[PDB]
Symmetry: D2
Amino acid sequence: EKKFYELPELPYPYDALEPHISREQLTIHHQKHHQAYVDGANALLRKLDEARESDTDVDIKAALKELSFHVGGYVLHLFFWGNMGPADECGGEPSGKLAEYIEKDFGSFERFRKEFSQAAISAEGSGWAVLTYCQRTDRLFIMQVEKHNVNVIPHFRILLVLDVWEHAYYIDYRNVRPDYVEAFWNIVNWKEVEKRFEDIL
Amino acid sequence: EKKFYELPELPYPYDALEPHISREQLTIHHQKHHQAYVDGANALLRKLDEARESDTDVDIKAALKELSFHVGGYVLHLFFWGNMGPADECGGEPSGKLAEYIEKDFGSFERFRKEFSQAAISAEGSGWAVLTYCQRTDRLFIMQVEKHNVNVIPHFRILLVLDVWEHAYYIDYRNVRPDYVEAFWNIVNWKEVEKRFEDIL
Amino acid sequence: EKKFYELPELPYPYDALEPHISREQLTIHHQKHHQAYVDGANALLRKLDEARESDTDVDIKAALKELSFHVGGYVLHLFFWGNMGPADECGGEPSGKLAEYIEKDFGSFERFRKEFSQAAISAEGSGWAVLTYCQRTDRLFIMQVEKHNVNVIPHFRILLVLDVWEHAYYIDYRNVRPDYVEAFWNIVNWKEVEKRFEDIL
Amino acid sequence: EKKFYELPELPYPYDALEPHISREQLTIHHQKHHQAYVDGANALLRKLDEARESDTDVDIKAALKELSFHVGGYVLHLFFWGNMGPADECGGEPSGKLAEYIEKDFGSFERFRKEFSQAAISAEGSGWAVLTYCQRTDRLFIMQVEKHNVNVIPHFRILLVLDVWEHAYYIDYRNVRPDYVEAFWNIVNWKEVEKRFEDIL
Ligand SMILES: [Fe+3]
Ligand SMILES: [Fe+3]
Ligand SMILES: [Fe+3]
Ligand SMILES: [Fe+3]
């Protein structure tokens, strides 16, 4: 029998990330938008299931475009919540292998922090900055994802994620995306990113 | 010291896939286009390396958009070559777990074959049909990738790939993409796809 | 000598559109975001001018992609302001030829209103619903623009425009884009749209 | 009663553009692909008409995305045929106002030719280089359209168009898009482009 998406609980209370992300900001991002991608993806799964059980045609171009949108939404918000936490337990900079790779690939943490920040700030409209890793060339890559599913390298795995959809910050920072991106570095959970990085060597 | 992309050898001689993909068709896809993504990705890596060594600014929005394009190109062609082979060793349909999942998720191999074929045929302009798998809901998904990097679900891994860029077939089939997609099923290497599928349970 | 973009004045005071769009909502959409597209487009124009004067190379792929983004932003906000006004002077439904075309192409105003509304609501992330007209087939078309420049038919002219970027409504309606879309019909300036429609027969 | 798209005749015989575009190349671009956009756009028009007559729901997101694709295809191929012709009647460079604008905006015809050529060559996958004009700033712009409908500035009108979809050249030039772009300048119909430019001042 079939299985579906559910809204994951946050790792922490809705006010865990203040003053950097407000309780109000966090609550509605999680409960309205992230939820919308859960429901989006599920509605579509049922649609495709139905067509298969009745052996009828669907517009799969439309279906798969939409599916990639919502599941991308679901997946990115999932990692996003996971690589933040309380400021007094988080922020700072990473250590261990991740630290070493950020050095060799970017020259310094500062350089990284800055490039990753430009990737977030400069995104045209809705999107994300995402850190990932090429196995093949043994290099950390940044990608700038538009929406939840545009300009992404298939098959590459997520290390660090920063939502820069307007819904993620407009309540706390209105238009001023750079202040939000700057606040973000106070609540990055490097432990989690470090862990993620280790499971792909 | 730094590391770069190289054109992978084919698993087989350039005429291994006739009459379905011609020697001419295969040779230029591999040696011109796939090569172009190698060089694209490498030029860009060097560009970013240079900016880091001289600690200067780059347009990283442009850079990362381009990077995702070429590395996507590189990665998809890599899996593409790998899940084809000689018709007399390949084609048919899969077995084992992959077979079981295709049944439960699509109802039958036929249904799958057909949906995957629509995903390839109906792609607007350059792109791919790609099979993948959601861990979370335990379901095979198809995605329809435009170019090498549009409408893809970040973090999802590649099982099966079908290039449907015009360069992949125009020599052998001109405009008639459906005949090319139909020929493809004669040379799918299910062993390889089966193996890929097992390494993500 | 060269010429550049400037932020157009609104046709009306920042509180002219209350209670449907608040003075706060309108002021920052206009003065922050619309402004940002002005500056984006100008920065880029100067960049291209400089390269031409020094007869040096630019990355024109990147340049033109960005240019289409900002100028699209500029152009769409320009028509957007223009086809709204005070509720007590606007809203209602159109008359004259536009009314006749909406009937013959959509069957009724209701149908139009509803389709246009789905086009706005359902847009994935940032984008617009835009009414336009095919000369060739003599039909009103709706297009759903993502960002400012995606999924638009080149050469077709703007009649009616509804911003559905989250910055357009998040202050007044937070996540609830449908309430914003619904409010919009209270402040549509049909006179303006009617006029626009007449200048392309 | 309703009206639909039809495949326009070429302004000239299928061998009119040799040796630069071959009779074979031209015939299949026109009769297969351009035709496909005609049928695509018509199928969709009927779909939307049916839903309106039966007052039923459609997926208008999907519909309008697809519509913009095919009508864009239709419109761009229409202008494309129109701004080419026989080499011995065409090519060269433009004169009159267009010539003057190309000078003041690009510095020279060479610069223009070169930038326009990069816009064509560098397009990632299927797309177009298109010349157009901003009324507001009184400047010629180039845009790089992906597919038929991506990265285009809404409302701007078409002056000059170069198809760089692989189907436009793969028969004559295989992978070597630069040779095709170079050949193109031999058959540009500047009379037509000049005329187009005059009708928007
Ligand atoms: Fe979000
Ligand atoms: Fe290819
Ligand atoms: Fe806006
Ligand atoms: Fe074409």
